[PDB]
Structure formats: C-alpha cells, structure tokens
C-alpha cells in the first residue's frame, strides 16, 4: 500500500494568485517502464470528482492550462494559476504506479484570502420550553470571522467545563468569504439549576484577548 | 458526454445489506473497468475493488472481501455494488469511477460518477425537539441582534429549517448537524437590525419528514425571570 499524503488540509489563496499543493508518496511512483503515474483530481461539494492532470503533468480533457504538475520521485506539486471562484473545492492526489491497491491523498481544500474579521459571539439560555421537558442546553454562535482557526471554551460559575459540549463549523461563505461556528452546551436541568454563571469564551487570532459572552441564571 | 449516474441515498440498518448502482452513458461500456472507493466524512478515499466490464472479472480488496460484490448488466450499461453486514463503520460516500482497458494498466480512474451516500444506523425514526432562542434577558444595545433555533433530538437526516417560512433568507448561518448517541442536533442563526426585532415576529419553521412533523417557533423576548 503507497500511503499519499497532501499538504496544507485546507489552502488560503486570494483570487488572481497562483495556488500551489503538494503530494507525497511513501514510495517513489517512478514505474521501471520510466513513466509516474501521479494524477491529480477536484472535487466539488456533491459532485462527481473530475481528473486534472495524470502522469505528473499531462492535462486532461478540457482542462485549462492554468492548472500544471510537476515533480518526480515522490514528491509532486499541483500549480494553479490565477484561481477562481470556479477552482475552489478540494483537490486531492493519487497513484497508480503499484497497484492495486490504487490509493489517494487526503485532499487540500481551497480557502478565499479576505479581510481579518473578529467572530460575532451570541450566547444563549436554554429555553423555557427545554427547561420544562427535563433538559438544558447553553448555545454560543460565534459568526462571521476570517481566518478559519478559533477555539471556544466553557466555563460554569467560572470553571472550565469540556464535558458536554458539541461544536459544528459551516463551510466558508459564499457571500462574505467568513466562517461561522456553533457551541452547545448540554446538560441535565438538574444540573445546570445548581449553578448561576455561563460563560462562552472564543479565541481567535484577531485578539490576544478572547470574546467573552456571559449570562447569570439569577439577573438580567 | 461520458456520464456515471449512481443511485440515490440509502438509510439502512445494522446488519442489513444495500445495492447501489452506476448507470453508464456516453461510451463503450465493455472496455472499462469500474472501480469502487469510499469516502468516509473527512478521511483518505479508499479503494474498494474493481469489476471488469469486458468479462465480469472482479477484484477485491481484502479489507472488504466477504463485504463487497460487484456486479454488472452488461445491456443496461449498469454496475452495482453489493454491501452485506452493514455496520455504523461502513457509513460513507461510495462512488463508482471508470478506468480505460486500453490506455495501459497504469491510465487513471478518469471519469467518476456523483457518489451515493449509505447511513447505516440502528435508531429508530424520532422527532426533533425544537428550541427557540431568544437573546439573553437585558436590552439589545447594538445596531443588530442574534436570534436562534435549536433542532435537538432527530433521527434520520435530514430536516429542513426556514426563518419566516423563507421570507428571511439574509443574515442566517445553519449548521451542519451533529450525531450523538444515534441522534442529530442542529442548529441555526439569523442575524437582523434591531429595530427589526422583536417588533416584527421571528419564526423558525423546522420539518423533519422521517416523522412527518413540521413546528413552529415564533422567538419571544425573554422576561426578567
């Protein structure tokens, strides 16, 4: 088995400038009949996969030559220049030098460069209607920010808090190129009508200080 | 014009078995192979095997030998993969791929079909509990206000979730939902002016169609208490 490995998971790139992903394998794909068998692919969200470029760097039908490949041994690059709005998906490596197995890298999926932007940070007290079927849930949505790295910590009357918490990550956005991110903290009602204060906490590079949105079950 | 259609998404049970198929279009289909891979959310695709549709000859990779088998109809230009003994491991996105007889053994996958996702789960059909949430109690003193809905509880996928009954389309983020001890939890956001909330209302209207059920919630202000 020829383990593929890609490098960067996720790529920022500005439109108009050149894009650039790596592709290594565990074992050189240079056949002894003196050609490698390194191609390149993109995939869309739900779309079938589309072939690039195979054999390095002989372009496929109906591909631009903005999109080249180079390399030998085991290590290849995909170029592709002046990206697009059209280029953006995950673009993803495989071989078949050794076969079978035929194997693939793990994908490099295209970021938009914009603007820095600080997370919009909204916290949320469970519901009066959760809270009388026996259940309480805490919610922080930490909305529209750029780039795609944060981290969000919980704390109950002041103490970090892990347990209980389920994040989800939407997909960069189509309109603004920003990313947004919710955090739900569950517990039982028996547990969270125990405590007073619930904090949500996000850490994002704009700021060596974290966006602390907080509430306390006892005022308003 | 070459196309590779496969069929739709399955839910199916622990253990069950499912057969998903790849219609072909647009080319010779006896001088091909098709070949399988799956596409675990966010991993490596991985090889499944190859059937020939030249002569049925078929190849499987060990990991999946006794799981998978290939077969083809040779005048509905259609290969089907066959999938036994389902577990919670075998969810993924499987799809099929061409790969030419006579370019060399070496030629590439070069065209692929859409891929047919396959949940397997052993949950029973359950509604969502659906929250709404209103800011925390106190005066919105910002330009904007965020609103939300939470969608806890479901089983299977999908739901649909609309603000105002899709009037409100700007300013939401809905999240990808989360499975949890065989149960999905979504969310979604919708950010407005202030002065659009609570003076005009704000509903999140959540359908899940597995139970049949549709809800509304209109977002109410919170009380001092």
């Known amino acids: 088995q020829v383990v593929m490995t890609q490098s960067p998971l996720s790529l920022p790139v500005s439109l108009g400038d050149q894009a650039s992903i790596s592709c290594r394998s565990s074992?050189?794909?240079?056949?002894?009949?003196?050609?490698?068998?390194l191609h390149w692919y993109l995939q869309k969200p739900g779309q079938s996969p589309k072939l690039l470029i195979y054999?390095?760097?002989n372009r496929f039908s109906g591909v631009p030559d903005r999109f080249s490949g180079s390399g030998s041994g085991t290590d290849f690059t995909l170029k592709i220049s002046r990206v697009e709005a059209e280029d953006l998906g995950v673009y993803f490596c495989?071989?078949?030098?050794?076969?079978?197995?035929?194997?693939f890298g793990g994908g490099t999926k295209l970021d938009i460069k914009r603007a820095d932007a600080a997370p919009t940070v909204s916290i949320f007290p469970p519901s009066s209607e959760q809270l009388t079927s026996g259940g309480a849930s805490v919610v922080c949505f930490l909305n529209n920010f750029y780039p795609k790295d944060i981290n969000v910590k919980w704390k109950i009357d002041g103490s970090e808090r892990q347990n209980g918490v389920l994040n989800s990550w939407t997909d960069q956005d189509s309109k603004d190129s920003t990313y947004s991110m919710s955090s739900t903290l569950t517990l039982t009602k028996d547990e969270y009508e125990r405590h007073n204060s619930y904090t949500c906490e996000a850490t994002h590079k704009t700021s060596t200080s974290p966006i602390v949105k907080s509430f306390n079950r006892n005022e308003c | 014009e070459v196309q590779l259609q496969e069929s739709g998404p399955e839910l199916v049970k622990t253990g069950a078995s499912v057969k998903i198929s790849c219609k072909a279009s647009?080319?010779?289909?006896?001088?091909?192979?098709i070949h399988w891979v799956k596409q675990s959310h966010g991993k490596s695709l991985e090889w499944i095997g190859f059937?020939?549709?030249?002569?049925?000859?078929?190849f499987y990779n060990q990991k999946f030998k006794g799981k998978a088998t290939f077969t083809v109809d040779n005048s509905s230009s259609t290969a089907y993969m066959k999938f036994n003994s389902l577990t919670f491991e075998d969810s993924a996105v499987y799809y099929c791929?061409?790969?030419?007889?006579?370019?060399?053994?070496?030629?590439?996958?070069?065209?692929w079909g859409q891929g047919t996702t396959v949940t397997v789960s052993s949950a029973k059909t359950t509604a969502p509990s659906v929250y709404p949430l209103a800011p925390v109690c106190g005066d919105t003193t910002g330009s904007s206000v965020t609103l939300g809905c939470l969608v806890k509880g479901y089983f299977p996928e999908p739901v649909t979730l609309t603000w105002n009954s899709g009037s409100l389309s700007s300013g939401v983020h809905t999240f990808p939902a989360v499975l949890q001890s065989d149960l999905y939890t979504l969310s979604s956001s919708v950010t407005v002016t202030s002065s659009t909330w609570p003076s005009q209302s704000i509903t999140c209207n959540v359908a899940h169609p597995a139970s049949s059920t549709k809800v509304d919630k209109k977002i109410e202000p919170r009380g001092p208490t």
């Open positions: 054999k390095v760097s």
């Open positions: 074992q050189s794909l240079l056949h002894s009949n003196g050609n490698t068998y």
């Open positions: 791929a061409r790969l030419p007889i006579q370019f060399g053994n070496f030629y590439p996958m070069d065209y």
């Open positions: 495989s071989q078949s030098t050794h076969i079978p197995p035929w194997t």
């Open positions: 647009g080319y010779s289909f006896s001088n091909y192979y």
């Open positions: 059937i020939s549709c030249y002569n049925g000859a078929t």
